[PDB]
Amino acid sequence: AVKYYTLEEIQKHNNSKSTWLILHYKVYDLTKFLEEHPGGEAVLRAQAGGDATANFEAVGHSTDARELSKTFIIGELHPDDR
Ligand code: HEM
């Protein structure tokens, strides 16, 4: 089933040991992706622990990038925090 994470819990994952971010209500664990991301590690680290949906869409990722992003989904933002 779907696992929910509250905004409070997501905010704790804003470091090198654990980098999580929110995109369109979905939670992504990008910890192991930081060094492979074509756009660099900095833009990810800076948005860690929060909603980066706007910044993500503002750069205009390709279909391949979006398809790949799905493999990093670990749950969704708790409904009451949306
Ligand atoms: C959800 C995980 C994400 C994946 C899997 C991902 C994947 C990629 C890939 C494959 C590219 C290469 C171009 C393309 O195929 O569109 C790219 C470029 C880029 N990404 Fe991401 N990205 C993710 C999240 C983000 C986020 C959250 C930001 C910003 C807050 C970001 C900023 C960038 C930037 C700036 C580039 C541009 C590189 C350039 O033009 O030199 N990405 N990303």
From Swiss-Prot:
GO cellular component: endoplasmic reticulum membrane; intracellular membrane-bounded organelle
Keyword field: Acetylation, Electron transport, Endoplasmic reticulum, Heme, Iron, Membrane, Metal-binding, Microsome, Transmembrane, Transmembrane helix, Transport
Subcellular location(s) per record: Endoplasmic reticulum membrane; Microsome membrane
Residue ranges occupied by any Cytochrome b5 heme-binding domain in the UniProt entry: 2-78
Binding site for heme: 37, 61
Main location per the UniProt record: endoplasmic reticulum
Superkingdom to which the source organism belongs: Eukaryota
Modified sites of kind N6-acetyllysine: 3, 12
Designated name of the protein: Cytochrome b5
Provenance organism: Bos taurus
